[PDB]
């Protein structure tokens, strides 16, 4: 079908999820096989964290895991129990050879990000929720909270029928023909008792032409 914006207009306009580099076939294998697990865990284990994006920051066996979240208290928490829990989890998933020093930072109106919307929609789908009402509420919450037009499509089973007829939403200006529009994208896989349902959301962060690279 259509291309995904988070790979189309990426690398020139949007900041990387993982900022690291190295020479060829020396040590990039471990880093690339390691960053994905942490990225997936930050959305699966900490569902309530509401991470707009995790900034993986690796340079010669040291990682500075940054998080952009609406409230630090999701991962910082009261009495610093959330911070120690997340630090120990990421340390056990990263080993003792790499420091963590993770930080959580506020991001301006995180609803203009796609990862949280995709993850929450997947959790709703795999929780056996009415798809119509859940999609309506997600669209309302993502349009009302200060974000521009949205482009949501849920493919797979529609909880009873319409398997090959994916429910695709189109709101506001969503030009994939544009190459600088800050159309953030994220795909997620809901593991429900009907298999896996794929949710993809394009969210407009405001046109990114001549806007730089920082997310």
């Amino acid at each position: 079908q259509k291309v995904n914006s988070n790979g189309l207009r990426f690398g020139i306009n949007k900041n990387w999820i993982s900022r690291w580099t190295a020479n060829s076939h020396a040590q990039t294998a471990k880093w690339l096989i390691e960053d994905e697990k942490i990225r997936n865990l930050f959305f699966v284990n900490y569902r309530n964290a509401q991470v707009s994006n995790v900034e993986i920051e690796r340079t010669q066996a040291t990682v500075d895991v940054f998080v952009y979240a609406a409230q630090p208290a999701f991962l910082i928490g009261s009495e610093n129990k959330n911070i120690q829990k997340i630090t120990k989890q990421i340390k056990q998933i990263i080993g003792r050879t790499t420091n963590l020093d993770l930080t959580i930072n506020e991001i301006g109106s995180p609803m203009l990000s796609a990862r949280i919307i995709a993850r929450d929609l997947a959790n709703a789908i795999e929780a056996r929720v009415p798809l119509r009402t859940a999609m309506r509420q997600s669209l309302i919450k993502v349009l009302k909270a200060g974000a521009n037009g949205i482009k949501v499509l849920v493919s797979g089973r529609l909880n009873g029928a319409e398997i090959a007829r994916d429910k695709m939403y189109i709101e506001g200006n969503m030009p994939l023909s544009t190459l600088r529009a800050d159309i953030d994208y994220a795909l997620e896989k809901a593991q429900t008792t009907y298999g896996v349902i794929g949710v993809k959301v394009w969210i407009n962060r405001g046109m990114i032409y001549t806007k730089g690279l920082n997310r």
Binding site: G11, W16, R19, T21, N23, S24, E57, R58, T59, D64
Partner: protein
């Protein structure tokens, strides 16, 4: 002094991110020391990763992701104490890796 003529190459995965570090080195090295070689671009020995789209038959259309291993050579010809003090504490962005002698 303090390891003179320290050949510090810089390589990154982003285009502007590495030239930014090179310019930061060339500007921070001045004001405390003069006549230092600045931006010295290299062939930037990158690699191209060709990946197919479908999990099944496709080879006439397999797009490439470009882990562009850029490369800028930074050579200090005047290695006064302030120049290399700034050099060792350039504090490049984390996406930048320095090969220093």
């Amino acid at each position: 002094v303090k390891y003179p003529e320290l050949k510090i190459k810089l390589e990154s995965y982003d285009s502007t991110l590495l030239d930014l570090t090179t310019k930061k080195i060339v500007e921070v090295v001045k004001g405390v020391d003069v006549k230092i070689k600045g931006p010295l671009p290299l062939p930037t020995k990158k690699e191209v990763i060709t990946i197919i789209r479908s999990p099944h038959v496709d080879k006439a259309s397999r797009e490439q992701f470009e882990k562009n291993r850029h490369k800028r050579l930074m050579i200090l010809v005047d290695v006064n104490q302030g120049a290399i003090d700034s050099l060792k504490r350039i504090k490049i962005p984390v996406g930048v890796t320095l090969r220093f002698s």
